[PDB]
Design a binder for these strands. Structure first.
Lengths: 251, 119, 228
RNA sequence: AGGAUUGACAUUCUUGAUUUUGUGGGUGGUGGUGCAU
């Protein structure tokens, strides 16, 4: 039996304004019953300031097991509940900065919050919101290459594709697993889903902002099948720019 | 060197890398340290009293025929960004690697078994 | 009535917020001191003592195993690149009209490249520049120093002897002034001090001697500062 | 790791490459207005 001031913790931290933090709740990384007693807090009661400080301390105490302990049962769900209460689809600024401070540690972020966002109830609006808060702040380069590999292996959905679109306008320096990833993306989008799914201007801007300058380690057969991408999926945005990138392409 | 590469791949499955002096002595006083690759004669006999003392204590603890080179260990291993993948970065990182949780994958790891079979 | 109603509503509501803030702070001190060092009584009762993850770690291992790069930051069209060049052209024109209205320590460069006659200086100095700026994590005074001594080197070379290879000296000093201008288009604040110091000393040179303290390297000093 | 950065029990400890500094450079999307809602 815990000392039973967690009810008092929720009582203040529902109507917090500004000031300080509880010290048991601060040293709770180094007390072994932290999740078993945060169930006793039963924290459906919540505030922006305490969300900020709580995810600060949880990324401070974030590994794989702690990610599955807290963030995969209630935290992304509280993100989801607040964007289902925000009637303009207007997420709040403190909750934004809580997600930016969540994106600090890349150690368990994948299975932490990147997997179950596409799992249940995913719209393209919240997909672009999550992609843009990825585009604001720091991202791990090689872990994001790994992310691009498994998210392109993951099945086709416009939320996954707009995550790849924003993370491709992140403007990396392309490695070899990624260029093989994009060419077997082209082996994915062939005739295939070309009779089962339609890809308008959004996917056209995907390979258009790809083929802006993402061309550097590309074989002449790969130049051929990007020209065949253009030949089949001709939109109006194919002629001078993709011809120009074919002319200025390299080995 | 292929055994070092496949045990590096095993540590890249596990990824709980506590490659430090205080975490190493905590794993020394607890029952977790089983494969530590640590260079012996570098800095005025810094660690070789207690790690070799608890090595000669009756546990196996030594799958070591020769300690890997400290200049290239951690930067042929996994540490950092892309970090000069084709530019051959051999700068000193941690240079001490521990393999955790019984250190054994499936049947293609008989070479580490015959490594810590003998002394 | 509107003004007093708004002021009374805002004052009573700020007083409500002040009561909530002060009550929250007092309760925060009470709960913190009541469960901080007192939950070491309940820290004696009870204690609590990878498929897609490994696929992600395998892909991150392959990314750490081999990587490459992308060219330079953008891709630009012909007419858009011409528009940017035209903006730079008109910028330089109007700024010029508004202006018109209103490894090298003076011997280390020669002691380094003092083996061959004419061609080794160009390639070795371009390699010195591209070897300083590549791994230059702080090398700015080194940059300024070799710009200074390449100035001094063309000074004490352009009037030693050109009665040897005139065509080879012609192409190597055309190369030296062209590489000089293309790099010192960006670095004036180390170059100009040494130009002013050469002015400052050659004035004393002409003060001392009637004519025989004027080199003919002074002429190419005038021409390369006039082209810079 | 022969020590970067994260949790500080105020000076001394429970993290671990997300670093770090330079050398560069992209603007910053939590937007409305005409369409079949």
């Amino acid at each position: 039996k815990v000392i039973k001031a967690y009810t008092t913790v929720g009582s203040i931290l529902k109507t917090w304004t500004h000031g300080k933090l509880p010290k048991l709740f601060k040293v709770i990384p180094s007390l072994r019953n932290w999740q078993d007693v945060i169930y006793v807090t039963n924290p459906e009661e919540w505030s922006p300031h305490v969300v900020y400080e709580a995810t600060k301390l949880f990324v401070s105490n974030l590994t794989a097991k702690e990610s599955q302990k807290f963030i995969n049962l209630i935290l992304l769900e509280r993100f989801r509940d607040n964007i289902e209460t925000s009637e303009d689809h207007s997420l709040n600024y403190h909750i934004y900065r809580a997600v930016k401070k969540s994106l600090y540690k890349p150690s368990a972020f994948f299975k932490g919050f990147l997997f179950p966002l596409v799992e249940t109830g995913c719209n393209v609006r919240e997909a672009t919101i999550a992609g843009s808060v990825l585009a604001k702040v720091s991202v791990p380069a090689l872990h994001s290459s790994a992310a691009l590999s498994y998210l392109l292996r993951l099945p086709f959905s416009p939320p996954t594709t707009v995550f790849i679109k924003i993370l491709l306008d992140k403007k990396y320096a392309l490695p070899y697993q990624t260029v093989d990833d994009c060419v077997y993306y082209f082996m994915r989008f062939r005739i295939g889903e070309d009779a089962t799914r339609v890809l308008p201007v959004i996917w056209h801007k995907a390979f258009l902002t790809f083929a802006q300058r993402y061309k550097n380690d590309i074989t002449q057969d790969q130049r051929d099948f990007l020209l065949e991408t253009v030949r089949q999926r001709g939109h109006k945005d194919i002629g001078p720019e993709i011809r120009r990138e074919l002319l200025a392409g390299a080995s | 060197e292929d055994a070092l590469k496949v045990v590096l791949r095993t540590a890249l499955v596990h990824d709980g890398l506590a490659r430090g002096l205080r975490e190493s002595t905590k794993a020394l006083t607890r029952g977790e340290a089983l494969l530590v690759v640590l260079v012996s004669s570098v800095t005025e006999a810094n660690i070789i009293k207690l790690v070799e003392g608890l090595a000669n204590d009756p546990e196996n603890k030594v799958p070591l025929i020769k300690v890997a080179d400290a200049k290239q260990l951690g930067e042929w291993a996994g540490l950092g960004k892309i970090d000069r993948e084709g530019n051959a970065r051999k700068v000193v990182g941690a240079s001490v690697v521990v393999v955790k949780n019984w250190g054994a994958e499936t049947d293609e790891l008989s070479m580490i078994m015959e490594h810590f079979s003998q002394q | 009535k509107k003004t007093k109603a708004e002021v009374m509503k805002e004052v009573i509501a700020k007083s409500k917020f002040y009561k909530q803030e002060r009550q929250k702070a007092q309760g925060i001190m009470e709960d913190q001191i009541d469960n901080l060092d007192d939950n070491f009584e309940d820290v004696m009762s009870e204690l609590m003592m990878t498929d897609l993850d490994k696929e992600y770690d395998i892909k991150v291992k392959e990314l750490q195993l081999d990587k490459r790069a992308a060219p330079s930051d953008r891709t630009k069209t012909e007419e858009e690149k011409n528009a940017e060049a035209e903006e730079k052209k008109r910028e330089l024109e109007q700024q010029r009209l508004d202006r018109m209205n209103g490894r090298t320590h003076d011997a280390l460069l020669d002691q380094v490249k003092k083996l061959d006659l004419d061609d080794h200086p160009k390639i070795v100095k371009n390699i010195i520049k591209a070897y300083q700026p590549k791994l230059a994590e702080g090398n700015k005074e080194k940059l300024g120093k070799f710009t200074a001594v390449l100035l001094r080197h063309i000074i004490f070379l352009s009037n030693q002897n050109y009665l040897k290879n005139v065509q080879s000296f012609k192409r190597t000093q055309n190369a030296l002034i062209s590489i000089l201008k293309s790099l010192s288009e960006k670095y004036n604040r180390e170059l100009s001090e040494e130009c002013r110091d050469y002015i400052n000393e050659m004035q004393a040179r002409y003060k001392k001697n009637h004519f025989d303290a004027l080199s003919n390297g002074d002429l190419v000093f005038f021409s390369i500062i006039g082209i810079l």
